[PDB]
């Protein structure tokens, strides 16, 4: 996260992280409940076995995965579909910094909550677009952005299964090893689950927005896996 | 703006328009109040609430 501010106690405690062989976070995930995780389908080509920690605003509790669903039609050329969901071998006990975010009812979500001004973006990425991995996670608040400037804005084709969030030129945005993170939205202080980090051309880049799993899109989807 | 559309029908969380009246649902792990608009925590740790 480039910009944005540290999790402070209790904040973000929906935050995953996987982290590789050799311990090291190279993306985040959203806790659904005590088994599932959200992340980015991307994120099951950046290590060949990995584990999710949970808890952990500081680097400085780990479950392993028992199956991995990933959507079917994810396209490495496009990012399109960019989503998974992970069972995990043991359930996560919730605690402090550690409790799942809301999914909400689909068109419910998209009326309220996707048109709400901003959402909130959180993971252990770099905090520079050339940087190491944060050791301390943090959030930063996005606007939710026109879909037309959107489209304008981007280089690659923004599918209906995308979103954008950001700042145009103000210097915050998500950055690497935040892809597969929560995007979440507030409604009345309850925390929804509303996108999932995917992909961005650079991090904070003047006329550029962070691009999203818009997870309305696969709200079925999402409660299908999370039954077998 | 009249239903859903003025301040979410006064629910919490879920606001669905059937028959012309607002109807509040809640997500999993909350209970919809008596009055039919708060959503009410089953447990400790509630989907999407801060633990501060
Ligand atoms: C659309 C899709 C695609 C475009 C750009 C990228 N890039 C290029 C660099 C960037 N990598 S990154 O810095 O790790 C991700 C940064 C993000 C910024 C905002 C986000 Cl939300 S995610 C990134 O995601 C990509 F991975 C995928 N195609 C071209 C493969």
Redesign the interface.
């Known amino acids: 996260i480039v910009g944005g501010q540290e999790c402070k ?3 973000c ?2 935050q995953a992280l996987l982290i590789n062989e050799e311990n090291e976070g190279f993306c985040g995930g959203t806790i659904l409940s005590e088994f599932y995780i959200l992340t980015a389908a991307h994120c099951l080509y950046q290590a060949k076995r990995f584990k999710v920690r949970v808890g952990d605003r500081n680097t400085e509790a780990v479950h392993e995965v028992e199956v991995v669903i990933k959507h079917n039609r994810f396209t490495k050329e496009t990012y399109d579909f960019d989503i998974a969901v992970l069972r995990l071998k043991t359930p996560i006990t ?12 689909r ?2 979500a998209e ?2 909550l996707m048109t709400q001004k901003t959402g909130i973006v959180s993971g252990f990425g770099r905090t520079h677009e050339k940087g190491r991995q944060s050791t301390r996670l943090k959030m930063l608040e996005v606007p939710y952005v026109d879909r037309n400037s959107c489209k304008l804005s981007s280089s690659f084709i923004i599918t209906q299964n995308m979103f954008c969030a950001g700042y145009d030129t103000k210097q915050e945005d998500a950055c690497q090893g935040d892809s597969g993170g929560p995007h ?1 939205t507030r ?6 689950v509303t996108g999932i980090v995917s992909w961005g051309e650079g991090c904070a880049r003047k006329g550029k927005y962070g691009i999203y799993t818009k997870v309305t899109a696969f709200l079925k989807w999402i409660d299908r896996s999370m039954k077998t | 703006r009249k239903l859903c559309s003025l301040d979410n029908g006064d629910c919490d969380q879920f606001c669905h328009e059937e028959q012309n009246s607002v109807v509040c649902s809640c997500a999993r792990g909350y209970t919809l109040a008596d009055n039919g608009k708060a959503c009410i925590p089953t447990g400790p740790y509630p989907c999407g609430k801060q633990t501060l």
């Open positions: 106690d209790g904040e405690p929906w919730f605690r402090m910094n550690v409790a799942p975010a809301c999914l909400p009812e068109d419910w009326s309220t979440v409604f009345k202080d309850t925390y929804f």
